[PDB]
Amino acid sequence: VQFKLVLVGDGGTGKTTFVKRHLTGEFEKKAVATLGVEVHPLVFHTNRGPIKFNVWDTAGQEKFGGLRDGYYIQAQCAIIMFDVTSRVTYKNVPNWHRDLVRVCENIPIVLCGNKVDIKDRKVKAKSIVFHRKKNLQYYDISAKSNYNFEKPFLWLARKLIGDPNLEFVAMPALAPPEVVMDPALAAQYEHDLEVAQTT
Numbered sequence: 001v002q003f004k005l006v007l008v009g010d011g012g013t014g015k016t017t018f019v020k021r022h023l024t025g026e027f028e029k030k031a032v033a034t035l036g037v038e039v040h041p042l043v044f045h046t047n048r049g050p051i052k053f054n055v056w057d058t059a060g061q062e063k064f065g066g067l068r069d070g071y072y073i074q075a076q077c078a079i080i081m082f083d084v085t086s087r088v089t090y091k092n093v094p095n096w097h098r099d100l101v102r103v104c105e106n107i108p109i110v111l112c113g114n115k116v117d118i119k120d121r122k123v124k125a126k127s128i129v130f131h132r133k134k135n136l137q138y139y140d141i142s143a144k145s146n147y148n149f150e151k152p153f154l155w156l157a158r159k160l161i162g163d164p165n166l167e168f169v170a171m172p173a174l175a176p177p178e179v180v181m182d183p184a185l186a187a188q189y190e191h192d193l194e195v196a197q198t199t
Ligand SMILES: Nc1nc2c(ncn2[C@@H]2O[C@H](COP(=O)(O)OP(=O)(O)O)[C@@H](O)[C@H]2O)c(=O)[nH]1
Pocket: 009, 010, 011, 012, 013, 014, 015, 016, 017, 018, 060, 114, 115, 116, 117, 118, 141, 142, 143, 144, 145, 179
């Protein structure tokens, strides 16, 4: 079965673009009009069987402050997103994490810095520290290129199932890349996180 996943972060960070990479989850999405949400059934296939993350994507109301309690309620996991080309989105991560945990106190949470395909990166590995204090997991991602798409969900699945050896045995069908994520740049970004991490 299944887990409610809430996807939060400033307007314009690429939450909608992200959740939409998973093609069947977009085709089978369900409206929850009473809370201004579209729930996308993101199925992933593990060595322990199938897991379904029901990802709750807003209809843009985060542009105007915290979300309603009904949005967060009964969430079993979360992704907090920021835009690595917009420093204020990173600065707002504490506010999202507070908005989130007030309603969902013991859930696994991953932090994702999106748009790493844009050449002029502002929030670099050296400054990404918020996950460390809260012992949350961080990934760089690029929704438009599918780069690291599966990472946040694999880390959440390991935490929810309590199996640090879980693996995905097949990739979901994803929208074809709309930008190129340069493999050398990606490698260097992962390296920089590793090097920031040993500090
Ligand atoms: N370059 C780049 N642009 C992105 C990416 N994800 C989203 N965008 C752009 O960011 C803008 C806001 O994306 P949206 O998904 O609507 O963000 P939301 O408001 O957080 O749901 C749109 O112009 C997107 O096309 C990405 O990975 N790379």
